[PDB]
Amino acid sequence: LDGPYQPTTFTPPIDYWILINSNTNGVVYESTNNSDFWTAVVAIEPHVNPVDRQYTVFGENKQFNVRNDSDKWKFLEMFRSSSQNEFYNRRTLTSDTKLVGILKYGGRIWTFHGETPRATTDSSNTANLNDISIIIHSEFYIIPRSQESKCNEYINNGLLEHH
Amino acid sequence: LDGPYQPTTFTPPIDYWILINSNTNGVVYESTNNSDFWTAVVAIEPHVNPVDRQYTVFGENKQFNVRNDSDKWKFLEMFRSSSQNEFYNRRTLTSDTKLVGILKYGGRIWTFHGETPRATTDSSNTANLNDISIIIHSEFYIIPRSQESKCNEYINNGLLEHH
Amino acid sequence: LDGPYQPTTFTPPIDYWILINSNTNGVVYESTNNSDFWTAVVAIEPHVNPVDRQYTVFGENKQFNVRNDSDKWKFLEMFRSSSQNEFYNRRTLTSDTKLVGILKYGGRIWTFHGETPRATTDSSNTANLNDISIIIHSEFYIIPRSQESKCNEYINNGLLEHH
Amino acid sequence: LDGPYQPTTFTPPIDYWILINSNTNGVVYESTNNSDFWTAVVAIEPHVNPVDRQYTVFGENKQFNVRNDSDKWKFLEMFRSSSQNEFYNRRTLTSDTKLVGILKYGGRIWTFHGETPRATTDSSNTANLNDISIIIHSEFYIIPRSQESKCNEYINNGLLEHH
Amino acid sequence: LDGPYQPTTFTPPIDYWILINSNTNGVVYESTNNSDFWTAVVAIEPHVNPVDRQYTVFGENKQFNVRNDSDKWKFLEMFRSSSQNEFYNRRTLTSDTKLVGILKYGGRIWTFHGETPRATTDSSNTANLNDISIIIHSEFYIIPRSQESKCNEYINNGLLEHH
Amino acid sequence: LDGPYQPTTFTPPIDYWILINSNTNGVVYESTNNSDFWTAVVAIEPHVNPVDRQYTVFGENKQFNVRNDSDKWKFLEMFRSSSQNEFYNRRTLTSDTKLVGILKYGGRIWTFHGETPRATTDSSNTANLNDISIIIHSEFYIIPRSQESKCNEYINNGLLEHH
Ligand code: NA
Ligand code: NA
Ligand code: NA
Ligand code: NA
Ligand code: NA
Ligand code: NA
């Protein structure tokens, strides 16, 4: 397991899973290529009634209507396809492991969505995969896509050394 | 909030809470003055039947019989008063926040025990408080004892920026 | 306030102010996209008569005729629009706070110029804003453009927690 | 020049100057052996009328009456010889370089006091020099006492690579 | 000498030598622009008979037939010009200093090859030099190309402060 | 394997091997308790005729007559039992792996001496083992004494992931 690495801003390499360990109910990461892909993940603690919360994403101050009816944490993918388009909750990962993953591969961005321990992967298209950089607000790990089933196991069951 | 700080080994200052954010089911920290105080905390994931697990603590390979009948994580304080005495589970913090705290103050070591969100503080005596250093295996924070009620709130309810 | 961060080389995100705290009379930062924008800032201590000083900028050894008739520090923006064009002092920030700022936004690079506490912002055009990376030689901070008035206050009056 | 090093807590080695570069008007460092020596340095920006400001020092919340009638920064050594004794401004370094130095040597703690560029060294006695650790709140450097005249030059004239 | 810097992933600036100090017989670095340039260097310890070893490069699991008949270490440049083309050992640096260098300059990637202390530089062409980033698995240094003869001296004779 | 860790100054925990990877012909580490134990290791490159070289050790400027008639590196333990006693070459580790080890255990300091791949351990006595801190000038690792045979294998054969 490569990591843990402290919060930083960098352009992740293609074909590597970025496994982020969220530690608070704020902005988990900000990922964009500044042309056609903007994704910021906000973490919602369990049992949150519909509320407007303010988040700083991509240098802007945005308001999101968020909620969480579950016992688990919810990580909301806020997406827009242009700097002028409005953010919307495109995907959600409901998790008690607090692990979030993002991968650049095959001209697409891959993340985990659904509910642990049965979260699965999905893709978003982009015309500029190379320029996708990320601002990671928490500790994170780097896993080669050749070991994705290990990343899948971490996303759904958490980081465990003992069985 | 002072932090987060990456895992390290140092002698913590007196009158400051060390708030450690555990991220796996291994050794959370190792604290000793090498004279009359040894404490290592091991993290047990939820729903673990009685099992013998091996841990490396203070350079030695030790076997502990651990269990967890709860939905929450259990952080087991393994204590001995001399390098020849046997470790025993002195205290336990049952938590879903995965936050562990240790403080050097008033000639004593203070930690949090019980079950969140109602965990409380306890003390252990020592004749050498100054030589107590720690090996921290996870991200951690530093909180002055003047802000202990904030540390108490984090231990019991987790790190939250939004309300 | 995001920081402080140790000296590093990275591609700063768009819409964030990079606030750099200079600590010596050398190269403060080097910023280029390798196509049409090169800016290196050199710091001149107070009361420097006209003198030729040598600086390593973008891997090259360059000589600049610098001076400072003021009681304050002078941060000289040395700019060229191509790797073959000659550097020239395009802008100057005269400051006693030793804080320098650079922002990528709206297809332009923004910096602070003038004299504290009345320094203002200016822009430089570029056809490739995304590829602008920076080599920062000192501690620096990251401020969202939504909080630029706070960055303006720091540039002109320094970092103050107490009023 | 050894450094710069990011803020940390450690036990400095004997016979080395710790040269700290203050960056705000807060607590610069906290140094104690927990037996007979407590020193915390607070930084006062220029032109401050007599005012009560609150500082967190050694985990406690203390109020200090501070002032600065000068154009330069003032670094106030707040000292007490026991955890029950009251802090008092024992020494002051008036500086425009914002560099502060502390040295453990010959059974004593040495710092710089006076006004730059003519600041000189002074000593404080202690019965336990080995247990003196420090919480450094800013970037700092390490200089062997064999090169103290270089540390003296930095304290009084600042860090300069060019002449 | 700029460094040492801990292992990281970043886009190196043009006109700077990246001098990497290998510390094990694994992947030294991975460099690609994701369009027409892939180079991963694997380190072979002395006296290795022809053997198939597995390496994780660019997130993929690859098998390389490697050997080393020499008393010195061999650093094998495994290159491909497209994600579908097969890796092949394009160049080799036989060294007892364990120092490896890569430079982006003049639209080309430059490395050191041959046998120390007479290793020389070579170039590889690319249509996208700006997007070449690197995953460095060991401590590394940064040297301006204006001081390449110093980098040459390090590559061939090692890092020496004393003569 | 715990590490690598960047150069730092700290008090190593008892019962852990500190495995230091030397990268130049200078001071490898400085270890003392300031009462009865001083050890600084200097690295001598291969084929050095008898020469006086200057080293900064424990803040003092000292001259050592060093030599190396071997093809391998020599790491010289310069020891004194008091701040007034003269340094002398107490032990030497002749190595082509450039790995140096120091351990605090059983009231003694343990290091590796001899010639790789047959270097063995030795002990030095001290009345104050707890106050022994170290200034490490290179990357280093931490190995529990329960895994000393692994540390022995690294000291004598180097860090190898592949067989
Ligand atoms: Na979709
Ligand atoms: Na008890
Ligand atoms: Na202009
Ligand atoms: Na006095
Ligand atoms: Na060729
Ligand atoms: Na002996």
PDB file of C-alpha atoms in Angstrom, chain B:
ATOM      1  CA  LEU B   1      -7.043  22.916  15.533  1.00  0.00           C
ATOM      2  CA  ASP B   2      -3.312  22.126  15.394  1.00  0.00           C
ATOM      3  CA  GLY B   3      -2.723  19.505  12.719  1.00  0.00           C
ATOM      4  CA  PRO B   4      -3.009  17.123  11.102  1.00  0.00           C
ATOM      5  CA  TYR B   5       0.521  15.797  11.658  1.00  0.00           C
ATOM      6  CA  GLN B   6       1.893  12.692   9.972  1.00  0.00           C
ATOM      7  CA  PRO B   7       2.987   9.672  12.057  1.00  0.00           C
ATOM      8  CA  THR B   8       6.146  10.364  14.046  1.00  0.00           C
ATOM      9  CA  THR B   9       8.052   9.626  17.247  1.00  0.00           C
ATOM     10  CA  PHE B  10       8.551  12.449  19.738  1.00  0.00           C
ATOM     11  CA  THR B  11       8.242  13.467  23.378  1.00  0.00           C
ATOM     12  CA  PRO B  12       4.879  15.257  23.644  1.00  0.00           C
ATOM     13  CA  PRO B  13       4.818  18.506  25.621  1.00  0.00           C
ATOM     14  CA  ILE B  14       3.105  18.613  28.989  1.00  0.00           C
ATOM     15  CA  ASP B  15      -0.383  20.193  29.127  1.00  0.00           C
ATOM     16  CA  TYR B  16      -1.342  19.340  25.523  1.00  0.00           C
ATOM     17  CA  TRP B  17      -3.869  16.766  24.340  1.00  0.00           C
ATOM     18  CA  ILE B  18      -2.613  14.436  21.606  1.00  0.00           C
ATOM     19  CA  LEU B  19      -5.684  13.551  19.516  1.00  0.00           C
ATOM     20  CA  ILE B  20      -4.925  10.572  17.253  1.00  0.00           C
ATOM     21  CA  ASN B  21      -7.138   9.595  14.295  1.00  0.00           C
ATOM     22  CA  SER B  22      -6.869   5.827  13.876  1.00  0.00           C
ATOM     23  CA  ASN B  23      -7.121   4.490  10.324  1.00  0.00           C
ATOM     24  CA  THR B  24      -6.644   0.706  10.636  1.00  0.00           C
ATOM     25  CA  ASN B  25      -6.975  -2.204  13.061  1.00  0.00           C
ATOM     26  CA  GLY B  26      -3.356  -2.157  14.194  1.00  0.00           C
ATOM     27  CA  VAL B  27      -1.173  -0.440  16.780  1.00  0.00           C
ATOM     28  CA  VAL B  28      -2.473   3.100  17.244  1.00  0.00           C
ATOM     29  CA  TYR B  29       0.346   4.424  19.430  1.00  0.00           C
ATOM     30  CA  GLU B  30       3.120   3.262  21.757  1.00  0.00           C
ATOM     31  CA  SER B  31       3.845   5.376  24.835  1.00  0.00           C
ATOM     32  CA  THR B  32       6.466   4.706  27.494  1.00  0.00           C
ATOM     33  CA  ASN B  33       9.001   6.384  29.754  1.00  0.00           C
ATOM     34  CA  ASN B  34      11.033   3.123  29.946  1.00  0.00           C
ATOM     35  CA  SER B  35      10.801   3.116  33.768  1.00  0.00           C
ATOM     36  CA  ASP B  36       7.254   2.600  35.089  1.00  0.00           C
ATOM     37  CA  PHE B  37       4.742   3.241  32.271  1.00  0.00           C
ATOM     38  CA  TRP B  38       4.051   1.282  29.078  1.00  0.00           C
ATOM     39  CA  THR B  39       0.834   1.765  27.113  1.00  0.00           C
ATOM     40  CA  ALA B  40       0.116   0.577  23.579  1.00  0.00           C
ATOM     41  CA  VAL B  41      -3.336   0.985  22.034  1.00  0.00           C
ATOM     42  CA  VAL B  42      -4.550  -1.586  19.499  1.00  0.00           C
ATOM     43  CA  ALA B  43      -7.648  -0.955  17.386  1.00  0.00           C
ATOM     44  CA  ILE B  44     -10.273  -3.694  17.003  1.00  0.00           C
ATOM     45  CA  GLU B  45     -12.747  -3.423  14.137  1.00  0.00           C
ATOM     46  CA  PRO B  46     -16.443  -4.092  14.861  1.00  0.00           C
ATOM     47  CA  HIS B  47     -17.750  -7.639  15.343  1.00  0.00           C
ATOM     48  CA  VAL B  48     -14.596  -9.595  16.156  1.00  0.00           C
ATOM     49  CA  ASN B  49     -14.955 -12.929  17.927  1.00  0.00           C
ATOM     50  CA  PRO B  50     -12.317 -13.821  20.564  1.00  0.00           C
ATOM     51  CA  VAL B  51      -9.079 -14.247  18.611  1.00  0.00           C
ATOM     52  CA  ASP B  52      -5.333 -14.136  19.217  1.00  0.00           C
ATOM     53  CA  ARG B  53      -3.699 -11.431  17.102  1.00  0.00           C
ATOM     54  CA  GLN B  54      -0.013 -10.562  16.951  1.00  0.00           C
ATOM     55  CA  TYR B  55       1.191  -6.987  17.406  1.00  0.00           C
ATOM     56  CA  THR B  56       4.628  -5.371  17.389  1.00  0.00           C
ATOM     57  CA  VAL B  57       4.775  -3.126  20.466  1.00  0.00           C
ATOM     58  CA  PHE B  58       7.942  -1.507  21.851  1.00  0.00           C
ATOM     59  CA  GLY B  59      10.044  -3.580  19.456  1.00  0.00           C
ATOM     60  CA  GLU B  60       8.651  -6.857  20.819  1.00  0.00           C
ATOM     61  CA  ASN B  61       6.293  -9.352  19.249  1.00  0.00           C
ATOM     62  CA  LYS B  62       3.295  -9.847  21.540  1.00  0.00           C
ATOM     63  CA  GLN B  63       0.075 -11.853  21.285  1.00  0.00           C
ATOM     64  CA  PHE B  64      -3.191 -10.397  22.601  1.00  0.00           C
ATOM     65  CA  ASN B  65      -6.579 -12.085  22.973  1.00  0.00           C
ATOM     66  CA  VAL B  66      -8.949  -9.450  21.585  1.00  0.00           C
ATOM     67  CA  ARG B  67     -12.666  -9.272  20.846  1.00  0.00           C
ATOM     68  CA  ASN B  68     -15.331  -6.734  19.908  1.00  0.00           C
ATOM     69  CA  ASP B  69     -19.045  -7.510  20.283  1.00  0.00           C
ATOM     70  CA  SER B  70     -20.075  -3.961  19.339  1.00  0.00           C
ATOM     71  CA  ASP B  71     -20.988  -2.048  16.198  1.00  0.00           C
ATOM     72  CA  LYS B  72     -18.272   0.475  17.098  1.00  0.00           C
ATOM     73  CA  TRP B  73     -14.497   0.293  17.111  1.00  0.00           C
ATOM     74  CA  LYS B  74     -12.711  -0.685  20.317  1.00  0.00           C
ATOM     75  CA  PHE B  75      -9.336   0.822  21.229  1.00  0.00           C
ATOM     76  CA  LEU B  76      -7.633  -1.372  23.823  1.00  0.00           C
ATOM     77  CA  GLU B  77      -5.086   0.147  26.208  1.00  0.00           C
ATOM     78  CA  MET B  78      -2.483  -2.570  26.809  1.00  0.00           C
ATOM     79  CA  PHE B  79      -0.537  -1.561  29.915  1.00  0.00           C
ATOM     80  CA  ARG B  80       2.403  -2.820  31.939  1.00  0.00           C
ATOM     81  CA  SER B  81       4.280  -1.105  34.767  1.00  0.00           C
ATOM     82  CA  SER B  82       7.663  -2.688  33.984  1.00  0.00           C
ATOM     83  CA  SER B  83       9.421  -4.234  31.006  1.00  0.00           C
ATOM     84  CA  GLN B  84       9.102  -7.625  32.735  1.00  0.00           C
ATOM     85  CA  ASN B  85       5.430  -7.349  33.731  1.00  0.00           C
ATOM     86  CA  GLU B  86       2.791  -8.803  31.422  1.00  0.00           C
ATOM     87  CA  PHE B  87       0.550  -6.580  29.324  1.00  0.00           C
ATOM     88  CA  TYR B  88      -3.119  -6.472  30.238  1.00  0.00           C
ATOM     89  CA  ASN B  89      -6.114  -4.627  28.819  1.00  0.00           C
ATOM     90  CA  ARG B  90      -6.317  -1.819  31.370  1.00  0.00           C
ATOM     91  CA  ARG B  91      -8.905   0.373  29.618  1.00  0.00           C
ATOM     92  CA  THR B  92     -11.065   0.447  26.503  1.00  0.00           C
ATOM     93  CA  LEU B  93     -12.531   3.272  24.419  1.00  0.00           C
ATOM     94  CA  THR B  94     -15.526   2.155  22.343  1.00  0.00           C
ATOM     95  CA  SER B  95     -15.906   4.708  19.574  1.00  0.00           C
ATOM     96  CA  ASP B  96     -17.356   5.315  16.128  1.00  0.00           C
ATOM     97  CA  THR B  97     -15.236   8.467  15.711  1.00  0.00           C
ATOM     98  CA  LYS B  98     -11.911   6.549  15.814  1.00  0.00           C
ATOM     99  CA  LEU B  99     -10.362   9.410  17.807  1.00  0.00           C
ATOM    100  CA  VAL B 100      -7.980   8.570  20.664  1.00  0.00           C
ATOM    101  CA  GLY B 101      -6.486  11.033  23.138  1.00  0.00           C
ATOM    102  CA  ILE B 102      -3.531  11.044  25.525  1.00  0.00           C
ATOM    103  CA  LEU B 103      -2.413  13.891  27.790  1.00  0.00           C
ATOM    104  CA  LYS B 104       0.555  14.447  30.106  1.00  0.00           C
ATOM    105  CA  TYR B 105      -0.457  16.730  32.977  1.00  0.00           C
ATOM    106  CA  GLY B 106      -0.103  16.996  36.746  1.00  0.00           C
ATOM    107  CA  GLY B 107       2.311  14.086  37.034  1.00  0.00           C
ATOM    108  CA  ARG B 108      -0.165  11.741  35.336  1.00  0.00           C
ATOM    109  CA  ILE B 109      -1.133  10.376  31.928  1.00  0.00           C
ATOM    110  CA  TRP B 110      -4.744  11.066  30.940  1.00  0.00           C
ATOM    111  CA  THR B 111      -6.719   9.194  28.276  1.00  0.00           C
ATOM    112  CA  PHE B 112     -10.347   8.831  27.205  1.00  0.00           C
ATOM    113  CA  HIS B 113     -12.279   5.654  28.004  1.00  0.00           C
ATOM    114  CA  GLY B 114     -15.858   4.438  27.906  1.00  0.00           C
ATOM    115  CA  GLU B 115     -18.229   4.619  24.938  1.00  0.00           C
ATOM    116  CA  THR B 116     -18.878   7.573  22.661  1.00  0.00           C
ATOM    117  CA  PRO B 117     -20.570   9.986  22.823  1.00  0.00           C
ATOM    118  CA  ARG B 118     -20.183   9.718  26.619  1.00  0.00           C
ATOM    119  CA  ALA B 119     -16.486   8.873  26.934  1.00  0.00           C
ATOM    120  CA  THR B 120     -14.726  10.403  29.942  1.00  0.00           C
ATOM    121  CA  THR B 121     -11.161  10.937  31.128  1.00  0.00           C
ATOM    122  CA  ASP B 122      -9.052   8.846  33.501  1.00  0.00           C
ATOM    123  CA  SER B 123      -5.542   9.055  34.925  1.00  0.00           C
ATOM    124  CA  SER B 124      -2.534   6.790  35.395  1.00  0.00           C
ATOM    125  CA  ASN B 125       0.268   7.626  37.807  1.00  0.00           C
ATOM    126  CA  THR B 126       3.970   7.816  36.998  1.00  0.00           C
ATOM    127  CA  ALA B 127       7.140   8.883  38.780  1.00  0.00           C
ATOM    128  CA  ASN B 128       8.709  10.109  35.497  1.00  0.00           C
ATOM    129  CA  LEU B 129       6.240  12.126  33.424  1.00  0.00           C
ATOM    130  CA  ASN B 130       8.924  14.079  31.548  1.00  0.00           C
ATOM    131  CA  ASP B 131      10.461  11.040  29.816  1.00  0.00           C
ATOM    132  CA  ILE B 132       7.141   9.799  28.385  1.00  0.00           C
ATOM    133  CA  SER B 133       7.535   9.727  24.596  1.00  0.00           C
ATOM    134  CA  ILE B 134       5.191   8.285  21.988  1.00  0.00           C
ATOM    135  CA  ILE B 135       5.303   6.473  18.651  1.00  0.00           C
ATOM    136  CA  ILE B 136       2.159   7.606  16.817  1.00  0.00           C
ATOM    137  CA  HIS B 137       1.133   5.347  13.929  1.00  0.00           C
ATOM    138  CA  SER B 138      -1.575   7.619  12.462  1.00  0.00           C
ATOM    139  CA  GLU B 139      -2.449  11.247  11.807  1.00  0.00           C
ATOM    140  CA  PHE B 140      -2.814  13.221  15.020  1.00  0.00           C
ATOM    141  CA  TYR B 141      -3.648  16.666  16.373  1.00  0.00           C
ATOM    142  CA  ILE B 142      -2.436  18.793  19.282  1.00  0.00           C
ATOM    143  CA  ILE B 143      -4.920  20.587  21.543  1.00  0.00           C
ATOM    144  CA  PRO B 144      -4.021  22.707  24.592  1.00  0.00           C
ATOM    145  CA  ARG B 145      -5.610  21.528  27.823  1.00  0.00           C
ATOM    146  CA  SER B 146      -7.204  24.981  28.033  1.00  0.00           C
ATOM    147  CA  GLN B 147      -9.383  23.712  25.155  1.00  0.00           C
ATOM    148  CA  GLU B 148     -10.025  20.221  26.539  1.00  0.00           C
ATOM    149  CA  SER B 149     -13.806  20.552  26.187  1.00  0.00           C
ATOM    150  CA  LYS B 150     -13.128  20.890  22.455  1.00  0.00           C
ATOM    151  CA  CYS B 151     -10.993  17.739  22.593  1.00  0.00           C
ATOM    152  CA  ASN B 152     -13.783  16.043  24.556  1.00  0.00           C
ATOM    153  CA  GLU B 153     -16.246  17.076  21.840  1.00  0.00           C
ATOM    154  CA  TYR B 154     -13.986  15.640  19.130  1.00  0.00           C
ATOM    155  CA  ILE B 155     -13.404  12.357  20.983  1.00  0.00           C
ATOM    156  CA  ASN B 156     -17.141  11.801  21.441  1.00  0.00           C
ATOM    157  CA  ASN B 157     -18.609  13.326  18.257  1.00  0.00           C
ATOM    158  CA  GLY B 158     -15.735  13.443  15.744  1.00  0.00           C
ATOM    159  CA  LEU B 159     -14.088  16.255  13.806  1.00  0.00           C
ATOM    160  CA  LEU B 160     -16.851  18.429  12.336  1.00  0.00           C
ATOM    161  CA  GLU B 161     -16.451  21.847  10.746  1.00  0.00           C
ATOM    162  CA  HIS B 162     -20.118  22.103   9.750  1.00  0.00           C
ATOM    163  CA  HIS B 163     -22.733  21.768  12.474  1.00  0.00           C
TER     164      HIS B 163
END
